[model samples]
Target: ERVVINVSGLRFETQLKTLNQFPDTLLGNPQKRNRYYDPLRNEYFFDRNRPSFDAILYFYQSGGRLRRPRNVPLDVFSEEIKFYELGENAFERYREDEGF
Candidate 1:
């Protein structure tokens, strides 16, 4: 199965298994994700930073890897990561990786 995520009007498509890999995240958890579901559009819509979401999606696809987008600042990116609930481990790693 596939999933459609709309961030600030930008659409992203990926497999269910990819999201399921990190069940604790916002998109990975069914109930949490469904809160933003747009039935009519058949997609989940999030009015969040489009650039930050690129890295968030990668966190799931790469199996817990987290990377900040070049255009996004450290503080802003950190908030997005936490918002997605990638877990404490992933958050801590990002902190260490970014050295702040």
Candidate 2:
């Protein structure tokens, strides 16, 4: 999955292997519409059809806060934003029964 690492004063982007592998729970929920499993292919889809990419970009550019570090002010932390895109090979088996 694609992720943007935003900190107090740093911004960087990296591709995570699986969307579920991300530590932050906020990024893995249904509302975000970023990650999901494709039953037909039996693989976890990260940025599948560009939904994840678009979601992350929308959140970052629109000042959406997925999570906040305890020590940092909300405004300052929110200002720090980054982005990354995941590769096609980085994926896991998808459960066919899972719902969106």
Candidate 3:
């Protein structure tokens, strides 16, 4: 799980394997996305993907599942998924009966 981030300066948390294929992820390139430290939060912070990130984060949770985020169109959401390269493995839903 995560504790601190720079953009929006929110205290959001998540899983250890949040991102694996994105450019900023462990599986990504040698060059790292620039990062900064937040003394108030006592943690290193990085620029984020804003509302788009919230949707992608669902996959990062062990028990988390995909449900259509209200008001946020699937196209916008899908773009984020593709941006992270999580589309191939993160397709399963929490429940088959769940509606978008």
Among all candidates shown, the one with the greatest TM-score: 1
How many steric overlaps does candidate 1 have?
0
Candidate 1 residues lying further than 4 Å off, grouped into runs, are none
Checking candidate 2 for backbone clashes, the offending pairs are 4-82
Q: After superposition, how far is residue 83 of candidate 3 from its true place, in Å?
A: 0.9
Whole-model Cα lDDT of every candidate shown, in order: 0.90, 0.36, 0.48
In candidate 2, which residue ranges exceed 4 Å CA deviation?
A: 22-24, 30-100
Off by over 4 Å in 3: 1-3, 6-11, 15-49, 91-100
lDDT tens digits by residue: candidate 2, 1-100 = 5544332223335444333454343343444433443466433344322222333434444343243344554334322322232221211111111111
- Predicted structure 3: lDDT: 0.48
TM-score of 1: 0.96
Window of ten residues with lowest summed lDDT in model 1: 56-65
Error of 2 at 19 (Å): 4.1
The number of clashing residue pairs in each candidate reads: 0, 1, 2
Q: Look at candidate 3 and give me any clashing residue pairs.
A: 1-14, 2-14
| Model 3 Cα lDDT, one tens digit per residue, 63-88 | 33555577666667666555555544
